[PDB]
Amino acid sequence: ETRPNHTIYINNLNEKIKKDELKKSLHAIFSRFGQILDILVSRSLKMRGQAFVIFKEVSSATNALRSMQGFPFYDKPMRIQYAKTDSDIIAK
RNA sequence: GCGCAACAUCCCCGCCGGUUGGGCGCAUUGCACUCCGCGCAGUGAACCGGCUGCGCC
Ligand SMILES: NC(=O)c1ccc[n+]([C@@H]2O[C@H](COP(=O)([O-])OP(=O)(O)OC[C@H]3O[C@@H](n4cnc5c(N)ncnc54)[C@H](O)[C@@H]3O)[C@@H](O)[C@H]2O)c1
Ligand SMILES: Nc1nc2c(ncn2[C@@H]2O[C@H](COP(=O)(O)OP(=O)(O)OP(=O)(O)O)[C@@H](O)[C@H]2O)c(=O)[nH]1
Ligand SMILES: [Mg+2]
Ligand SMILES: [Mg+2]
Ligand SMILES: [Mg+2]
Ligand SMILES: [Mg+2]
Ligand SMILES: [Mg+2]
Ligand SMILES: [Mg+2]
Ligand SMILES: [Mg+2]
Ligand SMILES: [Mg+2]
């Protein structure tokens, strides 16, 4: 789960929030500490309430669990965690 | 073929299916990298398959 290091995985999000509003209301919050490459969100039955954001490299992504970890985001605390594997765009 | 919905407890809304998006509810704490859980309804939204009826060649 936690404690490898590739990118962030945010959990326990408000699923009522639509995809577009969520994808941008995180980029505006998660670039205070790094540059964002791509943010990914799905409202499917599994990946709803979860997000996948990747930055420049690894400690361009350690700079996230860094900050938030229970941020009252849309009336529910965040829970961030390092992505177990790596996103298929950084494998190049 | 073209244009329409009279019939409607103000107006608007012919019928049956369906799609996309919006709403509410149930369920979901879930590690992905093209979409996709389900239910409810005057969804005063846009459309797709048909059909009934009215008017005009
Ligand atoms: N004050 C306002 O701002 C306001 C608001 C709404 C309407 N209006 C006016 O009030 C008027 C009321 O008109 P309406 O809505 O009663 O008529 P309509 O114009 O809606 O209906 C005419 C059509 O009904 C169809 N039709 C008639 N009998 C039929 C039957 N037996 N079977 C199937 N189809 C049939 C025909 O195709 C006909 O062309 C309108 O002309 C409108 O201009 C005014
Ligand atoms: N101009 C015109 N063409 C028609 C009319 N009715 C049928 N047609 C022609 O017929 C074709 C088939 O349409 P349909 O609705 O299946 O014809 P239909 O079933 O005989 O029509 P009904 O008489 O109502 O039963 C259309 O493409 C038209 O060209 C009409 O009233 N006016
Ligand atoms: Mg009409
Ligand atoms: Mg009318
Ligand atoms: Mg009427
Ligand atoms: Mg009615
Ligand atoms: Mg219908
Ligand atoms: Mg729906
Ligand atoms: Mg819904
Ligand atoms: Mg149609």
Numbering used by the authors: 102 to 193
Q: What's written in the study?
A:
Riboswitches are gene regulatory elements that are frequently found in the 5′-untranslated regions of bacterial mRNAs (1–6). Only very recently, the nadA RNA motif has been assigned to function as a riboswitch which regulates the expression of genes involved in biosynthesis of the enzyme cofactor nicotinamide adenine dinucleotide (NAD+). Although the cofactor is ubiquitous, this riboswitch appears to be rather rare and has the special feature of a tandem aptamer architecture. Here, we report crystal structures of the first, as well as the second domain of the NAD+ riboswitch, both individually bound to NAD+.
